[PDB]
Amino acid sequence: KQQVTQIPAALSVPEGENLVLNCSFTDSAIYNLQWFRQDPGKGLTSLLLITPWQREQTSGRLNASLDKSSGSSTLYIAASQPGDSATYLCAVRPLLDGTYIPTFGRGTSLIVHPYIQNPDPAVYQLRDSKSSDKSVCLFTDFDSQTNVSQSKDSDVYITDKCVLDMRSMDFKSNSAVAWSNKSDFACANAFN
Amino acid sequence: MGVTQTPKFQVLKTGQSMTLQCAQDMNHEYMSWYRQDPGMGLRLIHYSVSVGMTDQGEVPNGYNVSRSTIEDFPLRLLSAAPSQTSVYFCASSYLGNTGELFFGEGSRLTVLEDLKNVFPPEVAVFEPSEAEISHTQKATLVCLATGFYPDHVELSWWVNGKEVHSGVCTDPQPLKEQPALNDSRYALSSRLRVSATFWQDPRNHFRCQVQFYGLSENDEWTQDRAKPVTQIVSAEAWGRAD
Amino acid sequence: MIQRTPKIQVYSRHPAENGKSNFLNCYVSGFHPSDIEVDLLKNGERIEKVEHSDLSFSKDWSFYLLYYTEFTPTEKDEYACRVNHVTLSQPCIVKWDRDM
Amino acid sequence: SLLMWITQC
Amino acid sequence: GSHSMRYFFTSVSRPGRGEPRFIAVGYVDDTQFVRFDSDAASQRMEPRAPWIEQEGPEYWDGETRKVKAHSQTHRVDLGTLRGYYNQSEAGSHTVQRMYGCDVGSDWRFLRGYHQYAYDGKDYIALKEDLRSWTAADMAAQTTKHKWEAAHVAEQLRAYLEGTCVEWLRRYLENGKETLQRTDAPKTHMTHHAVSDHEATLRCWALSFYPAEITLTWQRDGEDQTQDTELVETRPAGDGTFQKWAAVVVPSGQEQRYTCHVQHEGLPKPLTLRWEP
Ligand SMILES: [Ca+2]
Ligand SMILES: [Mg+2]
């Protein structure tokens, strides 16, 4: 019976790096091998499709090949970008079993960190446009090697970091938000 | 064109029946249904290689399908149970050509014992810090959606009546306000960063809209607060000279 | 479009012996399209329980089928095969001959 | 044993 | 001797009469072993020869699912072809497909086949060596271009030269008692007075398997065709075949004629002559 294995399981890299993700399968009698992309909370986007008679395909910075050793495929991602971050799934279909059921691997979760050329880590306090009473704390402009722990006190909430990209001025930046409905809570003592 | 699944979101009461639809106009002989719990893998429910033919996958229990036409492959939940809360996907293909699989957008179902636990989000926009502006010459607005249940929302940013994507990053997933509580309400943040000059122009209008998917038109509702139906909740801010 | 008239042979499964049970066959072949009407007759009357083989075809795409029913031949009873097809303007009746 | 995959004309 | 495995598929549109009809039959040499008919109640690929029933549930489940997929693709082709030919929405049309393989006496691959027809005429087929396509008209050219983009010829050859030949050998071995049996023809000659100056001689060949056979007449040791009649080889209905050759001769000269019967089951060809 078919088993799809994908290595590495997780991958964390700086942008600009050329990546190699592997998808191996135990039963070489396949009709096709298909690579997909899936982001948290969203659907599946098909990336490429290869077969034993059409062993490679290219789509921009992506290219996949069905290797000579009939039980493996490699996905190559050139000049990685933070926008490439996602879980990469590979699936194969049977050539002979008479069921047509695809077999998926567990996926490869990829995180591509943005290059923060001029880090200016700082925590700012933002007020509600509708009523100054409420506030939010914004930790921003920190480098990609900084970690944000969604931790401590049950009444203090901290989001994970996310990258935004100001395309018109070719500028990206990291940030995390924190808030709490209490007194004593200052943005100075909010992060880590 | 492609694969169309409906509905995209749905809240059910324990014991209700529900039919999810799936149609394709590509003359695909093969149609199938999967469920995928959060962070887990795709599990095949049922599939069909032809009209009048259906077969079981890994998890057919509690579901029924029919294939009376080549275009449609409906999935019937016989009697909804909390364990059926998951994301459902329809996928089709030719049983020839390249055999390429085509996925629908997904249908998010949440099965609940008590519909009183459904809440819409409250939405607020937090304005850029003058300290941010004075240090970076950039201005970051934060949108925050809190207290919603279930986690069925779509957040978007609208500047001057047009949806924008540049300068935006929304949390990939909301946070449970009370992690150990089942049926805990959620919160979600987003950021929109613009140049200080663009934020300082009072003609610029920034709106954060959160599309919430809740109770349907025919669900019972006699509680004191407004029935938590599918609705758009938004908050806004206008640029400011000083 | 490209249509072909059926060839017809009426005969028994085993060598005919008067008074001994046997099978009466009507083999139809070389026709197109597949819809066809075949009846086995006993003294000009339609024999009710007639079975047939699964539809198949030859190298040139023309179809062939075997219709058959049990019968006990005699010296004076007349057996026949009656065929109707879109290529035939008149139904075709072929009589059974024990030495054919 | 039958062919498994057949491409439409 | 040589052997072959072959599948024959027929799909017929029935305007205002439900799904088109789909019938699939499978043969090894001159013996049918499987069947599928879209109108039958079972909705299963069914056994038609004894030896195939030794295959398990996985086989029958798989062959059933594959033959159903096959019916769905042909149901689509019926609509596509009508479109290519800009034809009747309410007119009845036929699509046929045949594929399979031939092996020699030593059971090694000889050739393969994959042909398609529309309304009884060649539409598209793989050439004799399986390395290219033959397309009848502009419609088949459209099919041909799609099939070459999907690498259909290569997909088929993998099956026609490998898998097809592997199952043919599996079947021949499991069903050896009946498939590798050679049944020599039972023969005899009949005589009838046609008229005042003529007499008919009918040479028979019965209960033989496989169907390949040769019946010929000679007069004074030379091939005879004048006033002769040779019927098409026909099935007896019990898995065997029948065939006859007749000749009209001048009355009184019937012993100058001989009937020669050649069949794989005969260690030596038989020669029949009229012995009153
Ligand atoms: Ca007629
Ligand atoms: Mg008899």
Side-chain angles (χ1 to χ4, degrees), chain E residues 102-130:
Chain E
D102 291 348
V103 306
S105 302
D106 62 359
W107 292 29
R108 288 178 174 82
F109 176 83
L110 279 180
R111 75 281 289 187
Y113 306 87
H114 181 279
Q115 303 174 350
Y116 196 103
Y118 184 56
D119 291 333
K121 190 67 182 180
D122 284 324
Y123 182 78
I124 196 172
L126 206 47
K127 287 193 179 63
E128 182 174 345
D129 66 12
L130 310 187

Side-chain angles (χ1 to χ4, degrees), chain C residues 12 14-23 71-73 96 98:
Chain C
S12 58
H14 309 289
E17 300 183 30
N18 290 343
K20 305 195 74 176
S21 187
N22 198 153
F23 289 87
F71 85 134
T72 296
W96 176 67
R98 64 185 60 254

Side-chain angles (χ1 to χ4, degrees), chain E residues 35-44 46 68:
Chain E
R35 151 204 274 177
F36 180 78
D37 174 1
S38 59
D39 288 347
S42 68
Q43 295 299 132
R44 300 296 293 170
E46 295 173 349
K68 289 177 175 174

Side-chain angles (χ1 to χ4, degrees), chain C residues 84-91:
Chain C
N84 205 359
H85 181 260
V86 296
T87 59
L88 295 177
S89 50
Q90 178 181 179

Side-chain angles (χ1 to χ4, degrees), chain C residues 1-4 7 9-15 23 25 27 29-30 32-34 52-64 66 68 97-100, chain E residues 8-10 12 23 25 27 32 35 48 92-94 96-98 115-117 119-122 190 192 202 204 206 229 231-238 242 244:
Chain C
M1 61 299 295
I2 300 300
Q3 295 174 165
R4 312 186 197 96
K7 290 191 298 299
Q9 298 198 64
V10 192
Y11 58 100
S12 58
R13 179 182 301 183
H14 309 289
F23 289 87
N25 295 159
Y27 180 64
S29 67
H32 207 106
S34 58
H52 67 273
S53 69
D54 302 329
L55 186 72
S56 180
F57 53 84
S58 306
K59 174 186 175 180
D60 68 358
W61 305 108
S62 67
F63 301 104
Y64 64 81
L66 180 62
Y68 57 92
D97 183 323
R98 64 185 60 254
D99 195 29
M100 294 189 62
Chain E
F8 299 89
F9 308 90
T10 304
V12 184
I23 300 174
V25 293
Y27 283 85
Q32 183 187 350
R35 151 204 274 177
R48 298 287 292 175
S92 180
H93 296 270
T94 304
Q96 281 155 281
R97 187 198 303 259
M98 178 284 291
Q115 303 174 350
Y116 196 103
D119 291 333
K121 190 67 182 180
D122 284 324
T190 58
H192 305 275
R202 178 96 76 260
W204 294 84
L206 293 165
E229 181 178 12
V231 302
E232 172 186 347
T233 297
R234 65 200 192 183
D238 56 6
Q242 311 180 169
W244 62 255

Side-chain angles (χ1 to χ4, degrees), chain A residues 145-190:
Chain A
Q145 293 181 160
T146 298
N147 293 164
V148 182
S149 299
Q150 304 72 11
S151 59
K152 62 177 180 62
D153 195 356
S154 61
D155 293 7
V156 176
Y157 305 95
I158 304 180
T159 74
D160 188 16
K161 65 183 183 179
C162 65
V163 189
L164 64 75
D165 181 7
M166 300 175 67
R167 305 166 198 173
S168 58
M169 57 194 301
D170 193 30
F171 172 94
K172 51 182 69 72
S173 55
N174 296 318
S175 62
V177 172
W179 70 96
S180 181
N181 299 181
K182 71 170 60 181
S183 306
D184 301 357
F185 178 83
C187 296
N189 299 161

